[PDB]
Every structure is written in structure tokens, then in C-alpha cells.
């Protein structure tokens, strides 16, 4: 997170850190043993790991389960990134307290202009490479579809919607991937790609979850 501050320990406590030796990409809590991510985040050997705030230090609220399936989108083009959402099973269901909770999904796709929360342990530096031990947040508004296809012509789809700000300074970035947009309560954001970091005209580009909410629906009923 690029320009944000500190979420404070445990006060996003959705968000999964996805470990393979080490915090690769972020996820979403949508239930007890159902996690989202971008489908690029896609590796073999993923624990997850819950109630996460200093992912280099054991505090004493950490959930670490396995993954025992993981469902990368039908119809992911990772030349595109069209389509950039997978589900994660866990081994074991998670222990859902006020510091490991789930997230609900939209109903209805959320709106430009609205104010969401894009939290994780991502790079902190537009020009240069910091990486943060606790989680980190930013508040971001949904930018429009006109100038969202402004700043990426050619690329961005209906699964897809531009999310902070256009004169730079406030962006997600690489470690933030597969990690929560969440806007009124609701995960309508899943962090997904963008040139650079919070560089001017270029913005944050996130999956459009409400898109997906049947087919993860549907895939979580019937494995
Ligand atoms: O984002 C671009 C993508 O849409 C495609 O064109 O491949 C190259 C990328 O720069
Ligand atoms: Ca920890």
C-alpha cells in the first residue's frame, strides 16, 4: 500500500495473508472455509494465513491452515487479467471470532464515487522497494468507467472497475494482490493489477466481484 496508513492489529479481520514460505499475495475471508484471491496469486503449496497483523512475528491471534483446493476461474486470461479471481478451500474450517471474520459479497456492484477500504502487506514505495511487517489500509474512491478506460485504453473489461486517484500518490501495489476492496461493508474489489504504483493517471485496477458472485455461490455449493 502505497500513500496509506496503518490498519491497526487485527481491524480488517477479512484479510488472509497466502504463504509459501514467506507472504506472496492477500485474500478475503468470505466464510469459514472459503477464501477469494486474484487468479494470478495461483501457486501450488498455499497456507493460509488468518488473524494476521505482523506477518513476521507470532502475537498470539494467527490462524495457519493448509489449502485443500484451490478454483481458479473458468475464463482467467492471465494475458488480460480478465477474470482475475480464484477460490481457495481450506483443510480445516477457520474459528470465527471479532478478529477472524468473514466478509459478505455484493449484492449489487458498487458505484464510482464510493469510498472503499484496500488493505495489505504490499509495497509502500511508488519509486523504490519498502515491504511492511503490519497491514496496512487505504481509502479510496471508485473512479468512473469513462476515466478508467481513459487511463488503460484498450484493456479495461466489464469485470474490472479503476479505484483511487488520478494525481498519484495513493495506490495498492505488488504484495497487495488478490487482496480486498471492500465498500460499504461489502468485498466488491479484488486487487488485481495497474502500471506501477500510484503514479499519476494510472490507478489501482480491481476485479468487479459483483460479476462473480453466482459462480462463487454455485462453486462453494458444490465443493
Ligand atoms: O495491460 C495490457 C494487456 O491488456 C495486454 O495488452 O497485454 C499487455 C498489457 O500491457
Ligand atoms: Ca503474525
Partial sequence: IVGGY?????????????????????????????????????????????????????????????????????????????????????????????????????????????????????????????????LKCLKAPILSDSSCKSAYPGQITSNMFCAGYLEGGKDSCQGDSGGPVVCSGKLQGIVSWGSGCAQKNKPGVYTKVCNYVSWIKQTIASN
Fill in 6 to 134: 496503518t490498519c491497526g492489529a487485527n481491524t480488517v479481520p477479512y484479510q488472509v495473508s497466502l504463504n509459501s514460505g514467506y507472504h506472496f499475495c492477500g485474500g478475503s475471508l468470505i466464510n469459514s472455509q472459503w477464501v477469494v484471491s486474484a487468479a494470478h496469486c495461483y501457486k501450488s503449496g498455499i497456507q493460509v494465513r488468518l488473524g494476521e497483523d505482523n506477518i513476521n512475528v507470532v502475537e498470539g491471534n494467527e490462524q495457519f491452515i493448509s489449502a485443500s483446493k484451490s478454483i481458479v476461474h473458468p475464463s482467467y486470461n492471465s494475458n488480460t487479467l480478465n477474470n482475475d479471481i480464484m477460490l481457495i478451500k481450506l483443510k480445516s474450517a477457520a474459528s470465527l471470532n471479532s478478529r477472524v471474520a468473514s466478509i459478505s459479497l455484493p449484492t449489487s456492484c458498487a458505484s464510482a464515487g464510493t469510498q472503499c477500504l484496500i488493505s495489505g502487506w504490499g509495497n509502500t514505495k511508488s519509486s523504490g522497494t519498502s515491504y511492511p511487517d503490519v
